[PDB]
Design a protein around this ligand. Structure first.
Ligand SMILES: Nc1ncnc2c1ncn2[C@H]1C[C@H](O)[C@@H](COP(=O)(O)OP(=O)(O)OP(=O)(O)O)O1
Ligand SMILES: [Ca+2]
Ligand SMILES: [Ca+2]
Ligand SMILES: [Ca+2]
Length: 376
DNA sequence: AGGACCC
DNA sequence: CTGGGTCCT
């Protein structure tokens, strides 16, 4: 029935990993760059008007003193990311990854184990770690309040372990489901944690200013709702279900309307090892098959260095962008799976390549990616 | 093969 | 000119 879920959210992740590489970079305003953008920056740099996905042009004019590090190669971020997940997995085996720097953990059985280990006189001694959302009053005879507080204590232990063992700093939110844990984790940042008591749930969801701030509502869904005059959380909460189902489908409608009330019963899913892995690169222009072939050889070479890992891929995919995306995939021959690997995959990929683009007609590629999936 | 979503 | 991921239809 009732759950205790934690959402762990690392502060300025890439920037943070960079500062643990050469500590010297600490105290100095830092940006991590990918091509022409600062994808994330530390809190020093952020204070001076800098923010994520803001171009170097709009980033150097506010901070001529902005320091830039190249973060196109995700290798070290990916490795640290899995170290965080593994350390969280020690607490409870059910950990779900969301991108490289967020994890949900279902702390329910863990909370329960801790409580039944306590005695009656110890119950009254239970205290919160970190913030309580909305400064809401704790009631120690409320069993839900007690469970959530034990949650906050486990969350603090997680954050202390991450810091002591990995040198990483992060936020956590403790709440009754994933949506709410994720909404609450960011209330105090960086490097703090907040617990959401059930009485403050409506306050948390109405504190949002647009429905696009609801996790699960992306670009397409938001713009759709905007085309129906739905702007605030309360609008979505009170809008006609039937009309909603019509315009977006039964699945999306009922789910996201449920989310507008802070209700989310989706389980925390054990992520385990990844289901795919890819190497990607983008560029102003690719217009020759020989250019493409070389980039593809680069991506594949790098990708093969990772294909060792934990399992082998049985499918390969190639994606391109032009001017959404386009792609072709096919199985990987079993003698190739049995592991010079480079020669036939390139041939495989180029055939895949010619399937979408024809050599003897003009074309302008802006992105190339190779993906290994269907792993066994 | 493409859609939607996440960081 | 970002670099990756997830599941669904
Ligand atoms: N279009 C995008 N929308 C959202 N996130 C993106 C997008 N493109 C890339 N990202 C990724 C790249 C970075 O890893 C990350 C950027 O910062 P983010 O994950 O939101 O938190 P952060 O760790 O960088 O800082 P913090 O969480 O403390 O605010 O999101
Ligand atoms: Ca986040
Ligand atoms: Ca973060
Ligand atoms: Ca959203």
């Amino acid at each position: 029935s009732s759950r205790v879920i934690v959402h762990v959210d690392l502060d300025c992740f890439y920037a943070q990993v960079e500062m643990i590489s050469n500590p010297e970079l600490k105290d100095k305003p830092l940006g991590v760059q990918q091509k022409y953008l600062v994808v994330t920056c530390n809190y020093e740099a952020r204070k001076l008007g800098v923010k994520k996905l803001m171009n170097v042009r709009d980033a150097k004019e506010k901070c001529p003193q902005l320091v830039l590090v190249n973060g196109e190669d995700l290798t070290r971020y990916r490795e640290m990311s899995y170290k965080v997940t593994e350390l969280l997995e020690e607490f409870s085996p059910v950990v779900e990854r969301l991108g490289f720097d967020e994890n949900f953990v279902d702390l329910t059985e863990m909370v329960e184990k801790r409580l039944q280990q306590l005695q009656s006189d110890e119950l009254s001694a239970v205290t919160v770690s970190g913030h309580v959302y909305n400064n809401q009053s704790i009631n120690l005879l409320d069993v839900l309040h007690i469970r959530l507080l034990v949650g906050s204590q486990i969350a603090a232990e997680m954050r202390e372990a991450m810091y002591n063992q990995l040198g990483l700093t992060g936020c956590a939110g403790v709440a009754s489901n994933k949506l709410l844990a994720k909404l609450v984790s960011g209330v105090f940042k960086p490097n703090q944690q907040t617990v959401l008591l059930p009485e403050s749930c409506q306050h948390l969801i109405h504190s949002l200013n647009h429905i696009k701030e609801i996790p699960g509502i992306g670009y397409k869904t938001a713009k759709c709702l905007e085309a129906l005059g739905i702007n605030s959380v309360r609008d979505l909460q009170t809008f006609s279900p039937k009309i909603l189902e019509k315009e977006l489908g039964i699945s999306v409608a009922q789910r996201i309307q449920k989310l507008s009330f802070g209700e989310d019963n989706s389980p925390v899913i054990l992520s385990g090892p990844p289901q795919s892995f890819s190497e990607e690169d983008s560029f102003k222009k690719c217009s020759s098959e020989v250019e493409a072939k070389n980039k593809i050889e680069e991506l594949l070479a790098s990708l093969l260095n990772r294909v060792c890992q934990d399992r082998k891929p049985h499918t390969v995919r190639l994606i391109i962008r032009r001017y959404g995306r386009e792609s072709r995939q096919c199985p990987i021959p079993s003698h190739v799976i049995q592991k010079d690997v480079m020669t036939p995959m390139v041939d495989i990929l180029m055939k895949l390549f010619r399937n979408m683009v024809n050599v003897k007609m003009p074309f302008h590629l802006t992105l190339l990616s190779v993906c290994f999936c269907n792993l066994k």
